[PDB]
Amino acid sequence: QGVDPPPPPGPPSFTGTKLVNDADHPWQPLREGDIRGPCPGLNTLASHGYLPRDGVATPAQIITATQEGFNFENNAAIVATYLGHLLNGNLVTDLLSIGGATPKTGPPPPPPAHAGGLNVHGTFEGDAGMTRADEFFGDNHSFNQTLFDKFVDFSNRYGGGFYNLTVAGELRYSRIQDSIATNPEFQFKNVRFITAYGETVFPINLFVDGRVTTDRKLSMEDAASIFRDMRFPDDFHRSAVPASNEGADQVLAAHPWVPGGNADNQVNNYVEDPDSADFTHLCRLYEFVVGSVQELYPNPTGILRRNLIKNLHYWWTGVNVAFGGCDELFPYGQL
């Protein structure tokens, strides 16, 4: 009949490095029904049992897992998790798929809401990923070896055979160029414009072993292990400090870029969007997403309305800190 959703966990008591690839969290292969998706972080956490191994979890479980497994910073975890949950999760059962649709999220919500998981393209997941192809080409969730080959190439060319901040700057730009030239539906605005810069530094800040204090750089063996196999490196120790998107500013600065997309269903036709969120206009992302939620839930009434109000508030608590102050919106009023 429904669940009453708890407020998000706070930061972990212990915030130092530790062994995360340990006896209680062994890698195991997929069973029938297990779900995986476009996030190598959540994928690895599920395949090591930090999340439920079936790849369906509550917001709270996702937050505690990203913190325990990788030392993802609390506010960043809140901002990402409730974004994903509002758009792609089931607010009544409080379950989110980290991939595509599954009966495991429970009785479906009223359309146009879907609870179709992080695979759903267009508002959250989008284009110019590092190891995933654009949705226009048919698969936005599976690892793509050709794209990983380019990851390797750019690491060879700019990072001495390792992935570092310099490589991220170059790879991010080049992937944008690839999508401009080949994808007539290419979008790079709003949520995607913000997430696309952070995602390129997560491998440096979170996938590099926490015992490495200087000259942080990711080997291709470790990259492959996480991005392709959903497996922590042997003896992997998480970041020694809570972390997220440190260095994303520098990635943008290496090749300044403006939100927009290919217009009129044609390649090599990128038009700027001046209304999109960007890095000096972050609250636009908040307002946009709240708009998107209204489109999904145009007139909720019961347990659903209640859980929407709570999840929206939860998200705001993170957004407010992360974005440096945003006026909370109340599209369904108060409880």
Ligand X SMILES: *[C@@H]1O[C@H](CO)[C@@H](O[C@@H]2O[C@H](CO)[C@@H](O[C@@H]3O[C@H](CO[C@H]4O[C@H](CO)[C@@H](O)[C@H](O)[C@@H]4O)[C@@H](O)[C@H](O[C@H]4O[C@H](CO)[C@@H](O)[C@H](O)[C@@H]4O)[C@@H]3O)[C@H](O)[C@H]2NC(C)=O)[C@H](O)[C@H]1NC(C)=O
Ligand Y SMILES: *[C@@H]1O[C@H](CO)[C@@H](O[C@@H]2O[C@H](CO)[C@@H](O[C@@H]3O[C@H](CO[C@H]4O[C@H](CO[C@H]5O[C@H](CO)[C@@H](O)[C@H](O)[C@@H]5O)[C@@H](O)[C@H](O[C@H]5O[C@H](CO)[C@@H](O)[C@H](O)[C@@H]5O)[C@@H]4O)[C@@H](O)[C@H](O[C@H]4O[C@H](CO)[C@@H](O)[C@H](O)[C@@H]4O)[C@@H]3O)[C@H](O)[C@H]2NC(C)=O)[C@H](O)[C@H]1NC(C)=O
Residues making up the binding site for heme b: 39, 126, 130-131, 192
| Partner in contact with 184, chosen from ligand HEM, ligand X, Mg ion, none, beta carbon below 5 to 8 Å by kind | ligand X
Q: Is the dihedral of CA 290, 295, 301, 302 positive or negative?
A: negative
Applying the rule CB under 6 A, the residues between 187 and 206 that interact with ligand HEM are 192, 195, 199, 202-203, 206
Q: Of 292, 284, 285, 320, give the one whose Cα is nearest residue 308.
A: 292
Residue 315 in contact with residue 91, Cβ under 8 Å?
no
133 sits near ligand X (criterion: CB under 6 A): yes
Structure tokens at 282: 């972050």
What is the C-alpha separation between 37 and 204, in angstroms, rounded?
Answer: 21
Stretch that binds ligand HEM, among 102-110, 123-131, 280-288, 293-301 (CB under 6 A): 123-131
Binding site members: 39, 125-126, 130-131, 192
Is residue 182 within the footprint of ligand X (CB under 6 A)? Answer: yes
Determine which residue in the list 147, 165, 196, 252 makes contact with ligand X, applying CB under 6 A.
147
Report the candidate in 335, 334, 320, 332 with the shortest Cα–Cα distance to residue 286. Answer: 320
> Using the rule CB under 6 A, is 77 a contact of ligand X?
no
Looking up tokens 């979890």 gives 57
Q: Does 167 bind ligand X (CB under 6 A)?
A: no
| Spatial separation of the C-alpha atoms in residues 288 and 329, rounded to whole Å | 11
Query: Tokens at residue 19, please?
Result: 């062994």
Binding site residues for Mg(2+), as ranges?
125-126
Backbone angles phi, psi at 95, to 5 degrees: -125, 140
* Binding residues vs ligand D12 (CB under 6 A): 79-80, 194-195, 198-199, 245, 322
- Interface ranges with ligand HEM (CB under 6 A): 38-42, 62, 66, 70, 72, 77, 80-81, 84, 118, 124-126, 129-132, 192, 195, 199, 202-203, 206
